[PDB]
Amino acid sequence: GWWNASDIPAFDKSKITRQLPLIKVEGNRFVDEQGKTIVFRGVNISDPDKIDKDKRFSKKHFEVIRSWGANVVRVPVHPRAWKERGVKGYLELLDQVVAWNNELGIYTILDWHSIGNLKSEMFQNNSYHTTKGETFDFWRRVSERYNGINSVAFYEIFNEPTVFNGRLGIATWAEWKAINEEAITIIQAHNPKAIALVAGFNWAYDLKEAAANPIDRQNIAYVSHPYPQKVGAPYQANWERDFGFMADKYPVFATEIGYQRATDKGAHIPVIDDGSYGPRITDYFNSKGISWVAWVFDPDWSPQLFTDYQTYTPTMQGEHFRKVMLQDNK
């Protein structure tokens, strides 16, 4: 696969005609280069490999995102699509997403979208399977190719670390910290402005162990994926204990949030909720200045933000997150 690729052309610079403001981390916030705080609220697209097989891979899908008010889009690269298109075929799609977002004024998070315990090579299922060699190779190639484009601002090293109570083996936070430090050294040696987003365990929900022993690099932020059934009621005090307290010292990006009713298409734990989670969590994130990205701007993967590609009509969570982005993004 990745170890057999070559003759990969460089990013075509004529696809881009403007530079967005450079974002950096200062203490617990993201800031632009006048020092103004920016909070990002946007959406995950489905994998570009899926949008292309649906024949919807065109700038007009991303213009609909811009009309919902998003100021960031997260792109979940699944290791299985990266192997099946191959490095050169997948970078053809990824370079077009980066150029479309850039021309629309929207920042990109590149997400290596695997779930499980990368150190022992045990994953939630065979679709997320990858290795440390392939993961570091992916980060080396994208940090080198998008270096210099300020709109590719965030590199989310590995979507959802989890050992599932031991079913996926053993990984301490100390060992996971050393792997993310090495991934961050690779990215910052190619792209000195990159901000890396690092996650903890329990499917990227917990930041308590990270706070006790933080990553030893600069320009980084921490992730949480506080879906509605990760914890029960008093929700805000449980969220604050598990990850929101970290937002007093480092920026926290909740790179997946989302919810739908028990009877909705593909509904599964932990995304099931009656509807009060949406206002409760975006108010909680406004109280703490936490950035977030809703999952997922697709009509098939669950929970859906819209019902079909003919109309892009928002679902129940889609209507709430779109209203909050149009109102609160600055």
UniProtKB/TrEMBL annotation:
It comes from the Bacteria. This is Cellulase.
